[PDB]
């Protein structure tokens, strides 16, 4: 009964571990040992977004690589023009306890969720001229920690009820709910093809789900603490998970195991945000130590530090063309780096 | 600079609006409600009028209080408790009719984000506590309480047990007793909030 099922689960876990070990022929460090390093990547703050008044908890780039939406717990989701530091929109929120935001790839919609257990979709292109809440997606039992736009109609949300859900912004209903995480799912990343995605939970595990069939494909473990940020490799064949154990890790879909760990002894704060570059050569990770460190994603060595924030950096993100890095922080400033 | 002048004008307009909104929001006094399940948070928030976060706001003697009940968040507190780092005080409500709350008070009082914020501790159900003591001795929940079996001393012992969790000299625990049939909760909150405001303003000016 229960004993037999537990024994079967242990046997299956051991088989998975053995199969992952068999696929391990060499590490990423050994293979990328021969290639030349990137040197010192010295990035300088080009712009500073001095609009918000509270902790900035999320910041998502537009698909045009120029517009950016920033969510702070001041009750505002201000849309930014990075080229001129102009405020293009300022959206008041029903609940000031917002801890995620998304920008639609089409540019028409902005999502904003948080402790209210509701993912709110805002229409930027309303004919009346002002921004209005086109939808208020509800149904998560726990706080919504992430939300990403597949298109103008679908959206995937990551919540604190240990479940991720796929929605339809028209019907306002959960098209598909993904279950299997045993802790708060604090992060989410969608694949470039938007047919697969990964979630970073507080059970020190990351799971890859299929949007269409709505089932977990692979479970990735190796972290010693809650994962706070996850991000796909631009090739879509790998992802990086930044946790509170002060280590980022790189996981491969096909190898089904971790390849490199981005850990330094001098660093003890946990990672709040992870993001790759356009080429995937740099892994820019934000830290609770008030600074963002640039990592050589292939040689697992620091390429530079994005120091300049007076508080913990809560969100990082590079543009689609890779021309800039935006790093929001709890000091109520978003800084563009280049 | 053809219509980018007008874009800059719009940006300045909504920056001014953001400044005005932030100034208006700074006037309110943010309070955080915490406690055990059915420990009296609902009772106090309902006796003063007005499953995610349940914000409650009112005005008491020219102060706009904002009570954030977070009892519906049945998740890991460590992932969202940092959102309330700027609250004026943490209102803690304890039901004396029922150790389950002592650990939570210790966790929330030694939290790295709550080392400066004063905690207001409410010990509700005083009359129910007296009835329970009459029914059965109070040593059941506190076996180490080798003392008299009287409500007057039991309340003081429980208050001391709860307050012993304070370790930071910069934060003060205001403990109050309530019988769930009194209108004095608002006045106690107001007194503690005025004291906390004075202390925080003095500390910010460096004089404290």
């Amino acid at each position, epitope marked *: 009964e229960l004993d037999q099922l537990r024994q079967e689960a242990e046997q299956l876990k051991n088989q998975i571990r053995d199969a992952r070990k068999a696929c391990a022929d060499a590490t990423l460090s050994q293979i990328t040992n021969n290639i030349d390093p990137v040197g010192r990547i010295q990035m300088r703050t080009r712009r500073t977004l001095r609009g918000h008044l509270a902790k900035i908890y999320a910041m998502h780039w537009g698909t045009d690589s120029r517009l950016l939406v920033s969510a702070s717990q001041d009750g505002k989701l201000i849309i930014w023009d990075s080229y001129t530091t102009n405020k*293009v929109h300022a959206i008041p929120l029903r609940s000031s306890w917002v801890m995620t935001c998304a920008y639609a790839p089409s*540019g028409n919609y902005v999502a904003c969720g948080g402790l209210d257990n509701i993912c709110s979709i805002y229409n930027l292109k309303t004919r009346e001229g*002002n921004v209005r809440v086109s939808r208020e997606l509800a149904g998560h039992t726990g706080y919504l920690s992430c939300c990403r736009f597949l298109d103008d109609n679908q959206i995937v949300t990551s919540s604190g009820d240990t479940t991720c859900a796929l929605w339809d912004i028209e019907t306002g209903q959960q098209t598909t709910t993904f279950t299997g995480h045993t802790g708060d799912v604090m992060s989410l990343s969608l694949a470039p093809d938007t047919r697969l995605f990964v979630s970073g939970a507080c059970d020190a595990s990351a799971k890859l789900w299929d949007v269409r069939e709505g089932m977990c494909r692979q479970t990735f473990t190796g972290h010693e603490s809650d994962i706070n940020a996850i991000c796909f490799f631009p090739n879509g064949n790998a992802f990086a998970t930044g946790s509170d154990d002060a280590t980022c890790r790189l996981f491969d879909l096909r190898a089904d195991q971790e390849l490199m760990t981005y850990s330094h002894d001098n660093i003890i704060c946990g990672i709040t945000s992870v993001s790759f570059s356009k080429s995937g050569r740099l892994l820019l990770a934000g830290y609770d130590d008030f600074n963002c460190n640039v990592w050589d994603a292939l040689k697992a060595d620091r390429a530079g530090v994005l120091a300049g924030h007076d508080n913990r950096v809560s969100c990082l993100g590079v543009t689609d063309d890779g021309m800039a890095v935006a790093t929001g922080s709890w000091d109520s400033f978003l800084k563009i780096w280049n | 600079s*053809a*219509e980018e002048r*007008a874009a800059l004008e*719009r940006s300045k307009a909504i920056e001014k609006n953001l400044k005005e909104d932030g100034i208006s929001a700074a006037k309110d006094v943010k309070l955080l409600l915490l406690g055990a399940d059915n420990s009296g948070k609902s009772t106090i928030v309902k006796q003063m009028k007005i499953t995610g976060i349940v914000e409650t706001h009112f005005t008491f003697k020219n102060l706009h209080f904002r009570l954030f009940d977070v009892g519906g968040q049945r998740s890991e507190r460590k992932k969202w408790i940092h959102c309330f780092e700027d609250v004026t005080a943490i209102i803690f409500c304890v039901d004396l009719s029922d150790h389950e709350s002592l650990m939570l008070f210790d966790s929330i009082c030694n939290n790295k984000f709550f080392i400066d914020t004063s905690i207001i501790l409410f010990l509700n159900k005083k009359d129910l506590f007296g009835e329970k003591i009459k029914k059965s001795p109070l040593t059941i929940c506190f076996p180490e309480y080798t003392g008299p079996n009287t409500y007057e001393d039991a309340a003081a012992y429980i208050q001391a047990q709860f307050e012993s969790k304070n370790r930071s000299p910069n934060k003060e625990i205001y403990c109050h007793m309530t019988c769930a049939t009194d209108t004095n909760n608002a006045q106690v909150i107001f007194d503690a909030v005025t004291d906390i405001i004075i202390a925080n303003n003095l500390r910010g000016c460096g004089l404290y």
Partner: single-chain antibody
Amino acid sequence: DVQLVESGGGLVQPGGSRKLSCSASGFAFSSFGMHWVRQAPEKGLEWVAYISSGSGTIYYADTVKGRFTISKNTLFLQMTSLRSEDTAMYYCVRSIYYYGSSPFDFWGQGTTLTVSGSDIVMTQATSSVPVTPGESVSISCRSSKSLLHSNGNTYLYWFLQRPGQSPQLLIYRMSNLASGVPDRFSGSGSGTAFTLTISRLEAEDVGVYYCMQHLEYPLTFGAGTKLELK
């Protein structure tokens, strides 16, 4: 939904005054910069006045400056010292300017008032064009200055005025299509040569097409191309 109904038209003796009122509804009028555009009974559109959001900046035309003043959800054009050249059908135009916005998108129905140098002049060589449905037509517009700003935006706006109807924005910034305008419309150009291309012409598309610049005030209009049906 969105509507700009405006009144204050009629016969005025020369030298008189009249305050035209534009009533706006169905949209956040407080956050829209309001324009005023007039058509003489036989001539084409002419820019009259512009008032920004929050009344911060107001611009006037060369023939309008001093005489007219532009000032809930109501737009006023205080118009004084009326001359015989002021007679026209004044339109109410809404336009909000942010990154990627669509200025001049909505036009009021317009009210008729009868009175008994450095500008970027836009010239449309073809005053009229005979055309049959189902083919591809083209309308051209020129300019005195290059409209391509250093930030990469050209500021040519294409407007379609159906006979007996208010102008409708078709193409803003010389490349972008307005919402609701069918994909059969396309616009292209560079600096000085601008060409509006219409594919699979329809019966409703017949009208007069107006070319406007937005690089600098005053907002000079084109002479208009009457794409008359043949």
